[PDB]
Amino acid sequence: VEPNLHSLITSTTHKWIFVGGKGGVGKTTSSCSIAIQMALSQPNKQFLLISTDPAHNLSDAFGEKFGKDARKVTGMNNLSCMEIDPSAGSIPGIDEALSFMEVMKHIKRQEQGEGETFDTVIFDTAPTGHTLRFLQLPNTLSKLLEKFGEITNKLGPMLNSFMGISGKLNELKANVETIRQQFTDPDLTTFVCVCISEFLSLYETERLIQELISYDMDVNSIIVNQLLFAENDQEHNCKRCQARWKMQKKYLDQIDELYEDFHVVKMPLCAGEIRGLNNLTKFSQFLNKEYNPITDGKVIYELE
Amino acid sequence: VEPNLHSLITSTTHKWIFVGGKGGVGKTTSSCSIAIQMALSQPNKQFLLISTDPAHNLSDAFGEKFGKDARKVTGMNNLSCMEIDPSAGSIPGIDEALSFMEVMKHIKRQEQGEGETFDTVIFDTAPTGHTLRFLQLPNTLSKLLEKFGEITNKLGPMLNSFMGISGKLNELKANVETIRQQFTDPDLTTFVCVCISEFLSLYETERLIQELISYDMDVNSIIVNQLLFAENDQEHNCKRCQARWKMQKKYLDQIDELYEDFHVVKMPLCAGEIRGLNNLTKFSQFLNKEYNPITDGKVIYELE
Amino acid sequence: PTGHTLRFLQLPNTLSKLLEKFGEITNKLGPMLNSFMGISGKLNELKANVETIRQQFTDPDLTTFVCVCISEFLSLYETERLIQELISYDMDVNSIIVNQLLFAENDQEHNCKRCQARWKMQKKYLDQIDELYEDFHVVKMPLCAGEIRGLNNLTKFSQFLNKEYNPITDGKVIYELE
Amino acid sequence: MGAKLAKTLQRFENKIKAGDYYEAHQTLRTIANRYVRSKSYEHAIELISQGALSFLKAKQGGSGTDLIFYLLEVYDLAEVKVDDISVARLVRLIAELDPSEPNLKDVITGMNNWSIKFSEYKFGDPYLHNTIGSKLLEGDFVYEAERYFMLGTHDSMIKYVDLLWDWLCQVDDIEDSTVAEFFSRLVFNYLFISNISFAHESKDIFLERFIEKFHPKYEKIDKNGYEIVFFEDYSDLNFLQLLLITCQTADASYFLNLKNHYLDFSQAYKSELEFLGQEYFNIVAPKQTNF
Amino acid sequence: MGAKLAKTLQRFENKIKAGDYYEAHQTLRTIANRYVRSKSYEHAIELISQGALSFLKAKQGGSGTDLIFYLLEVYDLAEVKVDDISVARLVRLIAELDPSEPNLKDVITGMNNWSIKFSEYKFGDPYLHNTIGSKLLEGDFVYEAERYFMLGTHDSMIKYVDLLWDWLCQVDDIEDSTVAEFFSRLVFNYLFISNISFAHESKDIFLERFIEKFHPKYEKIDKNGYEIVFFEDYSDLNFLQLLLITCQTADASYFLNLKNHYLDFSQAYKSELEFLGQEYFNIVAPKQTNF
Numbered sequence A, B: 001v002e003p004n005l006h007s008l009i010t011s012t013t014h015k016w017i018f019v020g021g022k023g024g025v026g027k028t029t030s031s032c033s034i035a036i037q038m039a040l041s042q043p044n045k046q047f048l049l050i051s052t053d054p055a056h057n058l059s060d061a062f063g064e065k066f067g068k069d070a071r072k073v074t075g076m077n078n079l080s081c082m083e084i085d086p087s088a089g090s091i092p093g094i095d096e097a098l099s100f101m102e103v104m105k106h107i108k109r110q111e112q113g114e115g116e117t118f119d120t121v122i123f124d125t126a127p128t129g130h131t132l133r134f135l136q137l138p139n140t141l142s143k144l145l146e147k148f149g150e151i152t153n154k155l156g157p158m159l160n161s162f163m164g165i166s167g168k169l170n171e172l173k174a175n176v177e178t179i180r181q182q183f184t185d186p187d188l189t190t191f192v193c194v195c196i197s198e199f200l201s202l203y204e205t206e207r208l209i210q211e212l213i214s215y216d217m218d219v220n221s222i223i224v225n226q227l228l229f230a231e232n233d234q235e236h237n238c239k240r241c242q243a244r245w246k247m248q249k250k251y252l253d254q255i256d257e258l259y260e261d262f263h264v265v266k267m268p269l270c271a272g273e274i275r276g277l278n279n280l281t282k283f284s285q286f287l288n289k290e291y292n293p294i295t296d297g298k299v300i301y302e303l304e
Numbered sequence C: 001p002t003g004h005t006l007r008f009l010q011l012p013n014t015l016s017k018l019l020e021k022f023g024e025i026t027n028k029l030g031p032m033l034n035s036f037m038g039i040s041g042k043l044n045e046l047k048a049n050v051e052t053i054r055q056q057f058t059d060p061d062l063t064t065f066v067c068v069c070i071s072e073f074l075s076l077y078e079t080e081r082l083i084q085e086l087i088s089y090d091m092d093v094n095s096i097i098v099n100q101l102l103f104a105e106n107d108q109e110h111n112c113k114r115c116q117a118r119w120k121m122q123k124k125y126l127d128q129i130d131e132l133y134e135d136f137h138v139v140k141m142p143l144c145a146g147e148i149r150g151l152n153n154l155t156k157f158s159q160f161l162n163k164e165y166n167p168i169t170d171g172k173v174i175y176e177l178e
Numbered sequence D, E: 001m002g003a004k005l006a007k008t009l010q011r012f013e014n015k016i017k018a019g020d021y022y023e024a025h026q027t028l029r030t031i032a033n034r035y036v037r038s039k040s041y042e043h044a045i046e047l048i049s050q051g052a053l054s055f056l057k058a059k060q061g062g063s064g065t066d067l068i069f070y071l072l073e074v075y076d077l078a079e080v081k082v083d084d085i086s087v088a089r090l091v092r093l094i095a096e097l098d099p100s101e102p103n104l105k106d107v108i109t110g111m112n113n114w115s116i117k118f119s120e121y122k123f124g125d126p127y128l129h130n131t132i133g134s135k136l137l138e139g140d141f142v143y144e145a146e147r148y149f150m151l152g153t154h155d156s157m158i159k160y161v162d163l164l165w166d167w168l169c170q171v172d173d174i175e176d177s178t179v180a181e182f183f184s185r186l187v188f189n190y191l192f193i194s195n196i197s198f199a200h201e202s203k204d205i206f207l208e209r210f211i212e213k214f215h216p217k218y219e220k221i222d223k224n225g226y227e228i229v230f231f232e233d234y235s236d237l238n239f240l241q242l243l244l245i246t247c248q249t250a251d252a253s254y255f256l257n258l259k260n261h262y263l264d265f266s267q268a269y270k271s272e273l274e275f276l277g278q279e280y281f282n283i284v285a286p287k288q289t290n291f
């Protein structure tokens, strides 16, 4: 497992890119990063980065106004940004369905009014609210149809056909199709999680992944930003920094033992927050090639 | 509405004849009667009278042994009798299904081992237990599939088809077929109820009919035996008999006002119980042509 | 660390109140006729009621709950809910401990952007805590180099729970536990 | 069941063409009640509806009206949702209703109330209103028809312009402010439900008839796609036309300038303008009386 | 998910062909546990089963055995019902098991128990038993194999006749009563489960081999479709053959007469005859000891 997102950044088949991470763990950053890396690596395909965060993180990350109307980020003719408001208890799945169905209407609407078509969309999942809850209802209720359809086959079908397997066939058809919307092919859809080496973060991460696994949604990418690696930076000293990383190293080992076959890309900590297309691309380069605190130390103390 | 079962006794399309009447109201009698009237009126069709009463009412009504193996009643090569035991709480409909499915296996089994085929079966419903409860589950659960199928159509089918109306069609197909097993055509299936002019009987009758109507099962025949008509019999007198009929006349009017468009055939009371093929045919003649206590008085005081 | 070991801090009041709905209603028209065929019930209920509510309420002067956290998103989320849970138990709560604080704008030996940036984030949330829990005892504890262990280093660090920690003067005590 | 219903329906309409109304009505209801008791709503609905149709066709408002109510009761008992089929049955019955039926309004109300409870329309289904409106108008219930048409379909809009046009014509002594009393209704009502399309179409049809009958002095003013039939003898109509377009801009300044130029009109339509200023200009301050 | 499982499965069997058994086993289970935690049983089942296969193919009974148990746990956790697919997975794993595996019997028991809980067979699925039987026989667990074969399929019947035939041949000093000790097992066991077909076929195959090897004096007696290989030096075999047919008649008289003629045999198979008399002759009276 290469601690990078290369295989994904260079993938031309993927058309659904999920990006989650509750806890103000730099979700917005990772989202713009993964979107830029894929757009630059595949200039022969249109990409769309959409967020639902009411704070308009994408507009504050790039430095330009993004609305419900998809707009190409200035300087790139391959990447586009979208900031919509996904809102402007009896049956499970319904509510979630309405929410997602609405965001997709905002997608097809921006592909008709210039933009034409985006080959792969970068979903910047909301900060809170399991917007992927409906990723299980369709399989759930359906399987219930199967228990319903079969059982409704009293002794027979000898006598059931005298008073009346189209039911056992159409069920299986409505079955696969459905399971094909959640499974949505691991080569076509994937989910990228973001976090940091900290107790609470791991807790939030561990559950997030479980949730997705119950959705059968492919997950094999865990981003961990804010890492110190304070044992290599050319300008040592500062116990305060060394102590903090000693704690981050503790958990990081729990992450490398918890997710052994996962793409755990460890990102470096930057002095200030990274904003602007420029500082973003230079920081996202580490998502393609591992960050080496021994040599790439310059690039970091550069964004500062 | 002719107060007789002529239209049914001479019908060659009907192939499912129901006969119910809880309360020891002479159900067995009416059953054998309706079966004989149809067999004699249509000698070009095989009929089968089957009962589930553990008392073996058909064997005590004709005077011969009838078992799970269909046997032609002696003297008739058009009528056949069948006496089977329909037995030898979580999901509604199941239990009933198993019970009926089994009786039908006993039917097809007797049409292969000599008898070949019965054009119309005379179902002598059990004395107790709603053996027709499953006559509603099939429509019930199915309609639930429709609420299930439709709702499972989140916004779209724009996006539901991008991730995956075969479901809206096959449902409607599995729908009709099902509804065709309960409806089973009013020209192909009907239900004959039996009772007497007495409070408790009417109570039992009224509910029975409601139950059948909820099954959408056609019902338009109400047999009322044991009637006195003690105001015409040539040999009047006997207050005891006159008083009893004054009460029967009371309720009979409630029956002619409760079931205005129903075939309310009023049968005469016989001294003793009617048994034997002979006394049965002569008594069943009144099911084809109304009984007149002024002229048919002889036929009755004859069965005595 | 996990598991709401205080969940049973609501059942006793719950089931009891249900007894009251039960006891009263069971009083068909009357008690005229209910006494001819048979308020000890309306009294003993109220007695079993108070006693019960006295085991949860357990006097705010006799029982209290101290919560601990740090100035970080996830922590606040965990804290906010924890407090809600306790309030539903009617359990007194007015103390929120926040350790690992930097106060890197006072320590005599400034520098280190890495440390200044982290506290800029901790200061962000700390303000949400001072506005979220206005009438709460929000004691802000200082961050120590390594973890504090041993009776000695513990008492010297716990002194700040009695008297507020001043990063301008108490800086010594901290860089001491190091 | 299906073969039995059809049959009896003839012996019923046979008792109706024979004169036996009581028999026909009594029998049908008791039988219908039976279906309802067994929750076989669908069956009862067709039976009841069919029975009501025949009664109304035979000029028997009494029975006809009664059955309509009974049908509605079931509609609410079966929780029948508002859709084409559901509405159709009522429309077909409303067509056979006698404009003078002493229950008319009650029947109408009942049907509409049902549409409201089983639809997302706070005032009832549009299409349904189109039919209801026409019925009310046949009984000279103009004001009631106006409301329904206002909340009706495109055809209603046409029948609303005809209702206002045939009323304006009924006036023996026409005046400059008379034509405004009718025309203004179209502009205000449609602007409240924010139906600019209907407001413009109703306006065009009404202003063109007014020009081909009264032959008033005017001249069409065109600017940036918009047109304003400037009447030389009807200032009220000019103001009203500008008000429409103004609301479309949702610009406070324009709304204030239009009112300040027509102070008199600003006091005649005081309340109306106050509302428009809140729905199109976000104005919370009440309307200061000019006079 | 489907494209991810397949991939990792290679990096697993890569750690196995490399020697990294601990790595391969530890990683797979933790990952498998994750699927189970999310109730994605199906996924775990394929992963676990596949992992167990490779381990057993690499002669790693330790890991292989462990995974089998883990698989079964899921089988019961997912309430996997007994059917072709479900059985197939276990059969494929049983084939790779080492007859000497210290867990053999435990593995077998677990699998069979599962088949019992999720099927209508009080003792487990027939087909499954056919495989289990062969495995037990490979570890010299004859008695255990016999039972399973007895409750197996048609192939089991053949492997049961071979198990008894290879045992009889193993006897150095054969005697008249020796051939009966083996042959009788076929007649009694199959008659208990009332499998006359297997009882007759197992008999024919065993009696024919016995004739082509020992060359005993005999003569086939045929009557009304039935045949009884009358051995001139093996009365035990004659009695046993008659006992079979007798049970088929379910006639008390015949059963009593056969026993009264063979008093000695009636005491040797006391308990056995008592049972047969209850299952084929409705006899409640115990078996009176002759000697």
Ligand SMILES: [Zn+2]
Binding pocket: A238, A239, A240, A241, A242, C112, C114, C115
């Ligand atoms: Zn530092």
